[PDB]
From Swiss-Prot, chain A:
From-to range in the entire protein, with total length: 55 to 108 of 430
Subcellular compartments: Virion
Coiled coil: none
Subunit structure: Interacts (via N-terminus) with the capsid assembly scaffolding protein (via C-terminus); capsid proteins and scaffolding proteins form building blocks that assemble to form the procapsid. Interacts with the portal protein.
Family per record: Belongs to the P22 phage major capsid protein family.
Protein name from the UniProt record: Major capsid protein
Domain notes: The insertion domain (I domain) plays an important role in the folding of the capsid protein by acting as an intramolecular chaperone.
Function: Self-assembles to form an icosahedral capsid with a T=7 symmetry.
Marked site: Involved in capsid stabilization and maturation: 7
Curated annotation (Swiss-Prot), chain B:
Record Pfam families: P22_Tail-4 (PF11650)
Summary of subunit composition and partner proteins: Monomer; homododecamer upon binding to the portal ring. Interacts (via C-terminus) with the portal protein; this interaction participates in the head completion. Interacts with the Tail hub protein gp10. Interacts with the tail needle protein gp26.
Name of the protein described by the UniProt record: Head-to-tail adapter protein gp4
Record localization: Virion
GO molecular function term, any single one: hydrolase activity
Length: 54, 152
């Protein structure tokens, strides 16, 4: 709030003003990967790949 | 190998036949060489049925190059004997001759050896049919809903 001191404040009545800020968002962060059955190395690795992704 | 060219193959075939060698004082006739090279190219194209026949590494001469003779045949070191024995067998009737029993036997043996490794390679087993399950022992698949084999 602005502030003035005095007795005769004619024609000196201020208005109002409230500022604002803008908040937005970016882009998704993925962990796209490909799972293959019939490998036995993509069977044990997938269970831990999920946790490493998290 | 000292047999590096189609002409080397042809000369070996004529020597096997006993038409133009040094054991017999005969020079390779230039009319015979072109006919034998044409027969070799025909027989090689026949064997290599656009990729679905006997694979030997032989290189077919295009129409661009002037000499069909002088170019490396590109065979492997273990195909030369088979190729030129079969070539002698094929071109023997040109001269009203007949390749002897040893030459015919070696031609058969060589062609079989040519196709042996390819036969082993093509002896492939088809996958499981699309209606065959994976079984519950394949735990990862039957958990992720792959109860059946794809096939094809």
């Amino acid at each position: 709030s602005p502030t003035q001191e005095g007795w005769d404040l004619t024609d000196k009545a201020t208005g109002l003003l409230e500022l604002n800020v803008a908040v937005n968002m970016g882009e998704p962060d993925n962990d796209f990967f490909q799972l293959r059955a019939d490998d036995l190395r993509d069977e044990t690795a997938y269970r831990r790949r999920i946790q490493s992704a998290a | 190998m000292q047999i590096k060219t189609k002409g080397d193959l042809v000369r070996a075939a004529l020597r096997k036949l006993g038409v133009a060698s040094d054991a017999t004082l005969t020079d390779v006739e230039p009319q015979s060489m072109q006919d034998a090279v044409d027969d070799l190219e025909a027989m090689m194209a026949e064997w290599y049925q656009d990729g679905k026949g006997i694979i030997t590494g032989y290189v077919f001469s295009d129409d661009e190059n002037p000499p069909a003779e002088g170019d490396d045949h590109g065979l492997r070191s273990s195909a030369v004997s088979a190729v030129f024995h079969n070539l002698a067998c094929r071109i023997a009737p040109d001269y009203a001759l007949e390749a002897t029993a040893k030459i015919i036997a070696t031609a058969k043996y060589g062609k079989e050896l040519l196709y042996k490794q390819t036969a082993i390679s093509r002896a492939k087993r088809a996958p499981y049919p699309s209606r065959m399950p994976t079984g519950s022992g394949n735990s990862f698949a039957n958990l992720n809903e792959w109860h059946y084999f794809p096939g094809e």
